Amino acid sequence: TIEERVKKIIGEQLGVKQEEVTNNASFVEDLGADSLDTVELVMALEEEFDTEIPDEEAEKITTVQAAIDYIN
Amino acid sequence: MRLVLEEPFKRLWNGRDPFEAVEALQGKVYRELEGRRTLRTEVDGRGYFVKIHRLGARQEWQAIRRLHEAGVATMTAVAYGERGSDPARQHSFIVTEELAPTVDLEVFSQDWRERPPPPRLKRALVEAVARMVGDMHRAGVNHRDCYICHFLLHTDKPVSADDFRLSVIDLHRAQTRDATPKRWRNKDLAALYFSALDIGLTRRDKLRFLRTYFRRPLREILRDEAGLLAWMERKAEKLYE
Ligand SMILES: *P(=O)(O)OCC(C)(C)[C@H](O)C(=O)NCCC(=O)NCCSC(=O)CCCCCCCCCCCCCCC
């Protein structure tokens, strides 16, 4: 199922515990990510869902909710 | 004097002056850039490109030879020659086999902006070029005409993200050393990028390229190549019009 996959990737990618992966948490300030990690996160999403995210959309993926919204 | 003959021209020019024989080969003739010459010819229907200089064939020949040593897929050279009393003003030739059926990557990506390919196929091609160019550079060869059109995708089989092969072609200006100076590395990388501004590469398709090209972490690349990458991005902006 998809709603969970996104949560799992952010966690395996950002090295944060699943409990911290909240739809309200922005990666930069809440999950300890810097710049590039978000992008490596966006990439990891592209690669797990075998899709492509346009640069306009990928720059709007700054929170966990932002991430799930796009996949669905 | 330098001369290497392979089949079919080894027998074909047995008791023949090969420098005469290349000039006697026939077929669709092309570029005549001051003494230079290119023509397609067939021997038992195969198809070969003939390049005659009367800058010479040496550049292509040593690039092709180094790339074969290094395992980088490229043209195969069946005939090569240099002669002349003035080592500067030599008469040279080189005949390469045709690679076919192929489609070059510019044509292949012609309309990715509007007919988007499968993402995985796309990234596999981006990465396959990153590997070849990196491999080329680490083997001491800089292309000098490193554009996507000089990479052949092989169409003798159906192409998928899991199964496809590339060949790099046109090495007529390629420089072969034991180590590729960084300025020359960067020129190729610049040219490869500018040839690809119109195929819908995301920012991440370009980072994917850089990582595979350098075989270094992304964070180190963005730090140590910062000025190169900022220049390329600035040129690429102006070139977009
Ligand atoms: P934070 O740490 O503050 O910043 C984050 C970030 C992303 C690192 C930073 O903002 C940044 O440095 N740039 C912003 C956008 C970006 O993603 N830049 C990097 C990519 S652009 C680049 O690096 C310049 C040139 C691109 C590299 C060459 C591309 C080669 C492509 C050729 C491929 C051929 C195959 C084609 C198939 C047919």
Author numbering:
A (entry chain B): 2 to 73
B (entry chain A): 1 to 54, 73 to 259
Publication excerpt:
WaaP, a cytoplasmic soluble protein, phosphorylates the first heptose sugar of LPS inner core, which appears to be required for subsequent core phosphorylation steps. Here, we report the first X-ray crystallographic structure of P. aeruginosa WaaP, expressed in Escherichia coli, which revealed a very tight and novel complexation with E. coli acylated acyl-carrier protein (acyl-ACP). However, here we discovered that acyl-ACP acts as a very tightly bound cofactor necessary for the production and stability of active WaaP kinase, uncovering a new function for acyl-ACP. The catalytic core of the protein kinase family was mostly conserved and demonstrated to be essential for WaaP cellular function, suggesting a conserved EPK-like mechanism of ATP dependent phosphotransfer.
The structural topology of the WaaP kinase consisted of a 6-stranded β-sheet NH-terminal lobe (1-118) flanked by two α-helices (19-24 and 73-89) with strong structural homology to eukaryotic protein kinase (EPK) family members, as expected from primary sequence analysis, and a predominantly helical COOH-terminal lobe (119-263). The COOH-terminal lobe was further divided into two sub-domains: the first sub-domain (I) (119-218) had structural homology to EPKs and the second sub-domain (II) (218-263) was composed of a novel arrangement of three helices, forming a channel through which a tube of electron density (approximately 20 Å long and 7 Å wide) extended into the COOH-terminal sub-domain I, ending under the kinase active site pocket. Weaker density matching a phosphopentatheine group extended from S36 in E. coli ACP that positioned the lipid palmitoyl group in the hydrophobic channel of P. aeruginosa WaaP. Differences from classic EPK structure elements included the novel COOH-terminal sub-domain, a modified Mg2+ binding activation loop where histidine (H168 in WaaP) coordinated to the second Mg2+ ion in place of a conserved asparagine residue (N171 in protein kinase A), and a shortened, structured WaaP activation loop lacking EPK regulatory elements. The WaaP/acyl-ACP interface was composed of two discreet interactions: a ~645 Å2 hydrophilic PPI and the insertion of the lipid chain of acyl-ACP into a ~680 Å2 hydrophobic invagination in the COOH-terminal lobe of WaaP. The hydrophilic PPI was formed by interactions between the negatively charged surface of ACP (residues D35, E41, E47, E48, E53 and D56) with a positively charged surface on WaaP (residues K140, R141, R221, R222, R226, R229 and R237).
